[PDB]
Amino acid sequence: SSLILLSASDLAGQWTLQQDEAPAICHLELRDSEVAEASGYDLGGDTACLTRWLPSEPRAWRPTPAGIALLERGGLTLMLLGRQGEGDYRVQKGDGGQLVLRRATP
């Protein structure tokens, strides 16, 4: 019963996605709530715009010890974002589009 629930927290904040080769930005919100259905944290914000870079709309995400992962509320990881630089994650996907998650600076 002493299990630590509120784990990741400094990750909370605002973030955005950037798809290269395809001018289009999307506001993303990394929630800090716990989610056992996907074993991660909720994913509010416009996740719909991801229906073009992911096979399903991610309702949750799970930070891994080597990058961020997006889930669909079932445990099926949709994409593994690798940390390229503290606050700069990038992933290679077919089609030729580069996603970039960076804390909303503006």
Swiss-Prot record:
UniProt keyword annotations, A-Z: Disulfide bond, Metalloenzyme inhibitor, Metalloprotease inhibitor, Periplasm, Protease inhibitor, Signal
DNA repair found in the keyword field: no
GO annotations of cellular component type: periplasmic space
Keyword DNA repair: no
Single GO MF descriptor: metalloendopeptidase inhibitor activity
Origin: domain of life: Bacteria
Disulphide bonds in the chain: 26-49
Location(s), subcellular: Periplasm
Family: Belongs to the protease inhibitor I38 family.
Role played: Inhibitor of the alkaline protease. It forms a non-covalent bond with the protease and may prevent its autocatalytic cleavage in the periplasm.
Protein name as it appears in the record: Proteinase inhibitor
Organism whose genome encodes this protein: Pseudomonas aeruginosa (strain ATCC 15692 / DSM 22644 / CIP 104116 / JCM 14847 / LMG 12228 / 1C / PRS 101 / PAO1)
Gene this chain is encoded by: inh
